[PDB]
Design a protein around this ligand. Structure first.
Ligand code: HEM
Ligand code: HEM
Ligand code: HEM
Ligand code: HEM
Ligand SMILES: [Ca+2]
Ligand SMILES: [Ca+2]
Ligand SMILES: [Fe+3]
Ligand SMILES: [Fe+3]
Lengths: 738, 738
């Protein structure tokens, strides 16, 4: 309570109206989803696959890499072409030849211009029709379409089967040699690729958009952005520029501490529990050196084929296996960065004593946390090699969906570990607010943050092996755009301000009101901002209305970062003994520079739904993904490491001269391979994706254009700058642990 | 010179690099203009009109209102449809009917869908070809196109002719009854319309865009935006956001006065010259009341036809006359407000004495201005009614182009009056900085601003009666986007800081650096920002490449207006005698609010070239025009009126209770007639313009859709608030002049 009745009500007011908006629209994503047809038949009488064969074909797609091989409805990896827009153009060109063979005498390519436009108008009448029969379950597609589907089916049966004809196209797609040894799996898998491009073509009931909201930009069947799609883009621009101006207008009008001579953390000297965190500062730097070194190993498969300078490590370590470890070990060391600074802050609040069985609680968390890492990395190896039986795949092995690629049995092992980290926080915080005090204001906010950071991983359930892919793309982003983006940015603002409150630099009054205006602004457009990962995947038009207007308000408090980047840096002059923490106070400054240039600048370039239409599935998304994940949550795990290196080894200097290469190799290393080798490839692809089609921007005839070859062979001029910038950090921490 | 060596070098550096970028591209706008063909002939052998007939048709179009009747290439008025898209659609449907009449047996409307798409591909083949013969001067268009042009000539001959059949379509376009009594004048005007929509269809040499950069969005002949258009749009967006964030960053990191007891302006008491400004302060409010009444009179012709509750004032006072007066008297009173403020500031700088024959120039300049006003209005009335002979039209009468609609002789009169104001400034300012002092830092900037504001009306020359329309649209925006937008915003910052410096509130050190940091920022994207009025008018793609990217940087220093709207309002508390200037210190705050909400927010909504494509010529442009013209330079001539009411009548109070109404009527009326009756009309026109075509968003089958009728019949509820606010302000000024 206290005098904070205004602030503590407007945070619950945001978390009540902007939290039912994932629930009032969460039923809209379910019952407006593209249905899987019960029976696919031809008009002559034969019966093709049904809804059982599609779902078993989905499990065949998961066993080869899932979204880490080639993207489906845009989301995935960006080397192999998306199989819902590469199946589409190969099916329409098969139809255009089977409708020209009995038209004059020739094919679609050898007709003059006025007569070849009399066939693309017949494509719009058949392929933008023949939807479901209103719970009759039948499809009954045309017999000229039954021959074109079976014609292109033999091309995808020959691509995943070790055939000698399609070499040097399995080399530009970074598929190993087989990718599916069994024969009935890839006969069932390419039935699933039909349904993922059946829904991309058929019209919804009465409207002028498709089931996937007109996504794969194809000039044959008239796939152009909607009328309501362009009108909801210009509304999304005026929300931003009238939000930035009205924030600085209300900031400049509605406004209106001697430091101690000793550091108050060295007066405690707690030996038994906080000395056991030396392992956790090793697991951060061991996974960080392993995660960069995979990056130079998965970017090598982009440039070359599968050679690796002599013998090929391609039948053991293919592209979709080294990419799966590159994302998954990245989310671990960001997670165990906060887990070190979380458990360090547990016994420091309740005086300087530990709870009962605290060191016994820490020493069994770490050996269960390392059980998951080397336990999930075996499941990826025994599933992409296709050794494990396919019925037991989802539980241990490989899930298929990116950012949740650890198996279901191992996924409980990550959820049980953070839930065990939850009770080790609450046993050390309930003797601090259940005591009769009157200053439990920051402690009540931090209690709500630790309760939310460990229970929002549980939304990674509610989807199993065989549920509908629109349901698998709704609960998946609840832990990527709400647990990594949202609630890692609440816990890293309070616990950041809790340290500056304890050292005696902020006066605990402007450390709480600054942590409820910077905890409700990030949540105003953060919980209903989940929906900008669900534009073109089985949704209606109001889903891009909630996710393009209420998503610009998480770009409003990110551009204005002059404050909270100077008043976290001018704390250096407030004490003579703030030279010992100079380098953590330089990492919490370069968090702010990449929270406006990775989340604000490069994050709004792809936000409005006319410019996510042409960009979704290109090389402009890993510009935003590399910069907003290492820049914002990747310098916090290195700011909470070189701070926790102090107070547990308070005798070793940080050795400047090494840190000036360990800090200025991460910044300039990240801003040189983005602005030379990932951004200009993302604009040659954008110039082709809006001119010709979506299939043209990922086709292998385009990605070997002799200008996109010299623009990814120049990744290595920035890769080795990042490499030595990462080695100089881990050599410091290993030297610091002695 | 002095300690200001950095700023006074970077301002000349900006005005040196961003000023050759107008000349080196003005050469490109000249030598890449769409040529007028020397001879138009048919393929059978006959000879149609030539280029002289096209130029006489241009003069005939000028004689009836010019751009105030119906827009040409988007620029103009927004009631009658743009003739270069309406002519285009009528000519294309005439060609489709003449090519279907000899195809099977029917027309384009009564053909099935696959066979009517075999004629639009022939429209794409014939109409996107047959350009000029490489300076051969001939056209030699197809005889079917000759028959289609001769067929659609008769409708536009019948529309401007008093013909009975075409009533109640001459009433929804607000044309009086005749608009052209002579017959050869409209017979040549139709040929001019043929030229201005011939340039909208033909392909440039080798490229894939037209001469007017693919402008009139027509799905028949494939008029869709380019790829480089969309690429420069996304580049413009990232330039804006990366500008705002870096400006706030470098503001927050790179930083580092007793008031007197008496007002220092009442200590001078200069009686002979400054008492002669009552005529100017009466002329400002007289033209302001007359202009608001003309605005209320010209919006009635939108809602009703030409009735005016009984007898019609339509053959004497048509829509074109009242619209021309509504723009021109607005520009006149906005100019003479600054003129009176500068002439007040003239003798105060050189101590408290006047130059020789100072009262005589003031006493003749007022009668010269009022002579120019009544002669221009008499010329408009005697030119639109078609009484004055067509040989003598451009000199006195009506020019045709909007914002320069006063005739050439009256234009020389206005330029001579502003030059007389210039020499009256320089005869009073040169004995103040030629004295041996060391404080001529602000006065040099003010002298350069006076030399800028008084000379660049002279770029309204260099185009006469018969030059090419791309040349007439290059020198026209040199006095609308560089003399009104740019150099009225330099003269209003230095004079404001000079007044706040002379009064003894700022310390003259932060009044100079803040008047070059806020004079070099507005000029970085202001002089090469002219080019966003020249996207789709006879230009190439480098012109929009300059005018998007280098124009987003004049939106960057406008959103951040928390500073320069609080440090100009917190000057009120610095003295007890700053209650006498309370209302100018609210006008100079409403200037900042509408400068961020009419130039930033609603001004960037229409800026990027993919969203100016569908918007150019709609009801979203008068939103930005009414907001940024009365909001920024309209409260400035009401701040410099109620400040100059002090120090010449320093005995009459401002009478609060009336000033609250005269402020919060203007603000609430301008913010309520924009957000109710001009913004959703603009959004409905945007939706229909991006769905169907450009002809559909201005057609009279669409602008009576029964929802656009109730959305402009609610203009009056915002009109009467603005009306009563204007009446309260003028009755206050008339009561104060006694
Ligand atoms: C020198 C440093 C790095 C290199 C060479 C590298 C390599 C790569 C490459 C080539 C991709 C593109 C994969 C594809 O095309 O499908 C990628 C994706 C990704 N990287 Fe890195 N990486 C580096 C640093 C990092 C770091 C430090 C992190 C996080 C802690 C990270 C997180 C990610 C993520 C999340 C993706 C997935 C993007 C997406 O699929 O949309 N990267 N990495
Ligand atoms: C602040 C921390 C942020 C993080 C950690 C983050 C992380 C990510 C990642 C890793 C992806 C790639 C997902 C994938 O490959 O499937 C992504 C995509 C995306 N992000 Fe962010 N992001 C952040 C901020 C933002 C912001 C502020 C916006 C504002 C509009 C935004 C808009 C988007 C959009 C539209 C996509 C979809 C791009 C696509 O699917 O191709 N992000 N985000
Ligand atoms: C109650 C107040 C006003 C009313 C009813 C009014 C009426 C109108 C109307 C209906 C238009 C649209 C003409 C068309 O559609 O072609 C217009 C245009 C315009 N008005 Fe006003 N007006 C008002 C106030 C003002 C003021 C105070 C200014 C001060 C400078 C102003 C400047 C302009 C300009 C420059 C245009 C031309 C916009 C363009 O052609 O793009 N108006 N006025
Ligand atoms: C600050 C003072 C400003 C003033 C006095 C002003 C005035 C005007 C006026 C009167 C028009 C209408 C021209 C016509 O009807 O032909 C116009 C158009 C336009 N303005 Fe502004 N403007 C200002 C700021 C801005 C800014 C900051 C931008 C930034 C991008 C901008 C972008 C545009 C564009 C693109 C158009 C063309 C719209 C069209 O032709 O339909 N304006 N301006
Ligand atoms: Ca991805
Ligand atoms: Ca206009
Ligand atoms: Fe997101
Ligand atoms: Fe402009």
């Amino acid at each position: 309570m206290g005098p904070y009745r205004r602030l503590w009500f407007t945070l619950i007011a945001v978390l009540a109206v902007t939290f039912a908006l994932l629930g009032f629209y969460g039923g809209e994503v379910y019952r407006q989803a593209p249905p899987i047809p019960e029976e696919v038949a031809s008009a002559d009488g034969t019966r093709l696959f049904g809804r059982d064969d599609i779902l078993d074909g989905q499990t065949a797609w998961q066993s080869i890499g899932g979204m880490q091989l080639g993207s489906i409805w845009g989301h995935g990896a960006y080397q192999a072409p998306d199989w819902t827009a590469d199946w589409l153009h190969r099916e329409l060109m098969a139809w255009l030849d089977l409708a020209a063979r009995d038209a004059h005498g020739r094919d679609y390519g050898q007709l003059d211009a006025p007569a070849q436009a009399a066939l693309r108008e017949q494509l719009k009448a058949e392929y933008r029709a023949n939807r479901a029969d209103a719970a009759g379950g039948k499809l009954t597609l045309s017999p000229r379409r039954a021959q074109a589907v079976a014609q292109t089916e033999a091309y995808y049966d020959q691509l995943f089967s070790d055939a000698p004809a399609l070499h040097r196209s399995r080399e530009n797609y970074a598929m190993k040699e087989n990718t599916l040894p069994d024969a009935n799996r890839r006969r069932q898998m390419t039935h699933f690729f039909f349904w993922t491009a059946w829904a991309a073509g058929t019209e919804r009931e009465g409207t002028s958009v498709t089931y996937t909201n007109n996504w794969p930009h194809e000039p044959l069947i008239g796939n152009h952005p909607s009328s309501e799609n362009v009108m909801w883009s210009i509304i999304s621009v005026v929300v931003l520029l009238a939000g930035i101006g009205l924030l600085i207008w209300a900031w400049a009008f509605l406004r209106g501490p001697p430091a101690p001579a000793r550091d108050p953390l060295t007066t405690f000297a707690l030996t038994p529990s906080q000395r056991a965190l030396g392992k956790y500062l090793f697991l951060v730097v061991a996974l960080f050196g392993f995660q960069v070194l995979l990056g130079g190993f998965t970017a090598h498969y982009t440039v070359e084929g599968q050679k690796f300078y002599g013998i090929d490590l391609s039948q053991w370590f293919p592209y979709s296996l080294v990419r799966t470890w590159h994302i998954q070990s990245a989310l671990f060391w960001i997670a165990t960065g906060f887990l070190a600074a979380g458990l360090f802050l547990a016994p420091l609040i309740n005086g300087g004593r530990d709870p009962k069985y605290q060191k016994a609680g820490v020493d069994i968390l770490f050996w269960a946390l390392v059980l998951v890492v080397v336990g999930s990395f075996a499941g990826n190896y025994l599933a992409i090699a296709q050794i494990m039986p396919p019925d037991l795949n989802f539980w241990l092995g490989h899930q298929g969906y990116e950012y949740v690629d650890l198996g279901r049995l191992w996924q409980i092992g990550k959820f049980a570990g953070i839930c065990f980290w939850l009770v080790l926080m609450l046993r050390g915080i309930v003797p601090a607010l259940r005591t009769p005090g009157g200053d439990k204001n920051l402690l009540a906010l931090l209690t709500a943050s630790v309760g939310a950071i460990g229970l929002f991983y549980g939304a990674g359930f509610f989807y199993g092996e065989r549920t509908h892919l629109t349901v698998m793309e709704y609960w998946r982003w609840w832990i990527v755009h709400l647990w990594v983006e949202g609630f890692f940015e609440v816990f890293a603002t309070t616990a950041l301000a809790f340290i500056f409150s304890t050292l005696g630099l902020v006066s605990r009054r402007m450390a709480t009101t600054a942590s409820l205006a910077s905890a409700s602004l990030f949540m105003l457009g953060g919980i209903p901002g989940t929906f900008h990962h669900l534009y073109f995947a089985g949704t209606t038009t109001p889903v891009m209305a909630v996710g393009a207007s209420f998503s610009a308000l998480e770009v409003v408090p990110l551009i204005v970062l002059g404050h909270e980047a100077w008043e976290n840096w001018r704390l250096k002059t407030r004490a003579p003994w703030m030279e010992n923490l100079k380098w953590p106070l330089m990492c919490f400054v370069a968090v702010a520079f990449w929270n406006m240039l990775g989340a604000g600048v490069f994050g709004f370039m792809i936000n409005p739904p006319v410019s996510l239409y042409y960009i979704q599935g290109l090389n402009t998304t890993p510009v935003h993904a590399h910069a907003a994940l290492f820049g914002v949550y990747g310098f916090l795990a290195l700011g909470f490491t070189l701070l926790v290196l102090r107070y547990i080894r308070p005798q070793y200097a940080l050795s400047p001269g090494l840190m000036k290469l360990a800090f200025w190799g991460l910044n300039l290393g990240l801003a040189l391979m983005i602005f030379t080798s990932l951004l200009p490839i993302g604009l040659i692809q954008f110039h082709a994706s809006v001119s010709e089609g979506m299939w043209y921007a990922r086709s292998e005839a385009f990605m070997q254009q002799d200008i996109l070859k010299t623009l990814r062979w120049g990744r290595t001029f920035g890769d080795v700058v990042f490499l030595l910038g990462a080695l100089a950090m881990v050599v410091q921490v290993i030297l610091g642990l002695l």
